[PDB]
Amino acid sequence: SQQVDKIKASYPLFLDQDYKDMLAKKRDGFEEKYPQDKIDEVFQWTTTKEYQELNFQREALTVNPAKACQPLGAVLCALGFEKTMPYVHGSQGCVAYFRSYFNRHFREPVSCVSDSMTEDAAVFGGQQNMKDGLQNCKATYKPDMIAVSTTCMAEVIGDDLNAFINNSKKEGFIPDEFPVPFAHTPAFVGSHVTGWDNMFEGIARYFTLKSMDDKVVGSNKKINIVPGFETYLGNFRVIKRMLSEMGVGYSLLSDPEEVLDTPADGQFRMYAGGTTQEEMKDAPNALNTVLLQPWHLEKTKKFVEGTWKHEVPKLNIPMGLDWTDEFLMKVSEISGQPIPASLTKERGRLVDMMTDSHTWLHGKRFALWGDPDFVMGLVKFLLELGCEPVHILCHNGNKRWKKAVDAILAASPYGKNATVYIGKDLWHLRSLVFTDKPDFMIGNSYGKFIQRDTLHKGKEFEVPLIRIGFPIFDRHHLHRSTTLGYEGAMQILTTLVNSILERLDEETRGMQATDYNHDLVR
Template identity: 75%
Template structure:
């Protein structure tokens, strides 16, 4: 099929033409050394069995689709949340290209980040020369107020000392002595993207406050600090802003990338936009306390706030769903002395009304989910509040304490009695669970679509539809602007879940003259 200006077919219909079908068949026959289709189908069927699941869960030496990303990805997101800050990754250029494209595809926005392009010579002799040139060039070309440095595997394996390199760069005049260059070591071979965010934030807090604590004391500025953690739903930053403003609470969001990751198309490119100011992070120790919105992912931040800022960090869960949003607002009211606003009480009532309207459709529906630790915990809690049943919760990078906390939440509800919590597992483990446990839906990021495809290949009755909530979302647009926190976020999640259930019901009942006696106009 030849393309011409009057008729241009995109890839999907183009590759289904007879010409392309023939080309692809010839390619398979001549070059791929492919096994017979009967053998492929036989192996596929075996991978859907309980026998294979037991073998799958006993593997020790390989990870397949890990359900996490690496530390510097989180460090870059954290740095983007500070005003006029350039994320700088000490390591290879390819790593930074990965981080930028990962965020590009999720946020549909340009993402600024630089690398000092370590190559083979730096891997042998160290990357100090790269950092000298990199810091000088980044400062001259992009004119940031702050350069926030993190590392890749290459720099960590050879043991590059960021503190020494940065100090040497300043001594030799590559950047001014007083130019802010906070840093964090973010080795990709341990932890995950959430660890990297935590490490980078602790690095920022340490750089701007550790040596200037004299005269600072909790409560001096009358504000409350909010630390979001690795958060990619821009609506979640905005809903915290809105709720605090409606209550009249003085607060500071420590790392807020909403503006730079959601710039308008008005003809002006904004390399920097919004973010937490340098003065705000310097003043953070004077706050009443620091509230961690994703506490399981912010262990270093918590320790620093408690030991250096002398803050009594409240023990709260991620504010997802009704009860945990209530807990956040009541704690904020207690700390600030400001009552919960009438508008938030009305919003809460609307959520309860929505839950009442939809509970009959969600009751008894079975959900499996995967994602980051705090998100998975909050989603589990919310599903139980909605009356849905949870079959499996999988988090690759959670610890045993988190697992115990999640199991206690499940045991406290009649809808979580048969659930299993999996830590240190990957999406290939999750795939096995979808075949053997057969939930009605799975909740997770875009990578789950391939598991949905596999379940459908076994047969339509085995299909487990994916509900896209999490990070990254590459194959749907604008979901990153949505909200999952607060009453507003619970409304969005509830709407998404119940409409997925109803969409599936319509799909199953639209057979003309067979199942359409349940193809109802009103649900």
């Protein structure tokens, strides 16, 4: 039944007695469901140390991973270039998923095409798909550039991207001067961030490799900035804002902030802003190149150093106080520009917030996960706040990265109870937050199912989730936030302290039971 004056959606419609009795009859009559006491027994078992030890013995099964496949990052990299169409050579199902995944995180259109390789192509390659696909794409959507990656089926069969594209130009399907950079992005190697590195190195190769004779380091007096896989709009804007405040000439290579934030003014803009082909052609003339996320920009670093002859400085991701400081001092040394008073004052205002909030942050235990560069920056900032990052999980991390993070933890008393996990998924983390309960989780939307599970054991065992990372699907507009620089540190700080205070207010809201501590002033 429905009352027209107060219509009920699925929740709480199906809580009505007639629906509740109906679901009970379906269960008892035909579902052949395990009895409830057996379900509770098994659930309680999955929260124990015994289950965790079996859980960590896995080596063939992955449950709730915290990573995606390469071509997803290759798409995000391509979208950062002006009038550029991402183009995934292979099966069209992947592109439907790529667009939907980004659609839901940014809540914006995401343009990407496929050449729709099918069963027949599995036997004789997708050369014809490339010829017709490139010509159809250029004619229909009028891009200035097409950046080609690959799905896993095209990688298994062994399609030669270089040859197929050259034949498309040779046979007259697209003009020979039309830029078509390419990169092999195998889903069964690395993760989405590896796909970002591969796509970017491919685009850099395309525009510089053969034209290195007339280049000389530093002639354009700019600094190249390579962001890497970055899903926060504010992180692109804060980097450009700080360098502009310093008067530093810079070149952001792959800049999707405009195309992922077009205005709703009556017209759909498929393309917007982005790095120009001219900026890529001229990049070798920069003073140097800074890699914002070096732990998944390995391939790009080798090319920038090997071919452009730039001496990429050893810099951590500019997150937190120390690493933002070092980033600015290195930019100052390279450009010859002093750090302006405005950034000095902004730094002091972040420190002021740290002093004002340090009593609520001290000792708070956190589990967290994400991509390698983002995680260690988050770990670094937590230690600076006096927090304990007890559970550090990076599904797509490697041994060399874990060694670095372990050194960061050892250099602080707040890293004493911390452990770094690589190759583990969110079902591994579920066990960790049960057997070694932290105070909060910091992670993407998939963590909400770990919070649900902890609450089922008990209110005193619930581990609330703080959404910082990718993807974020169940809140709106957090993709506009910032995590880099002093600005990002202030936003993270504010989110952490107020999550602690919100949780405290809830636990002290019971009248005449716990509301003695329901303070007005905190």
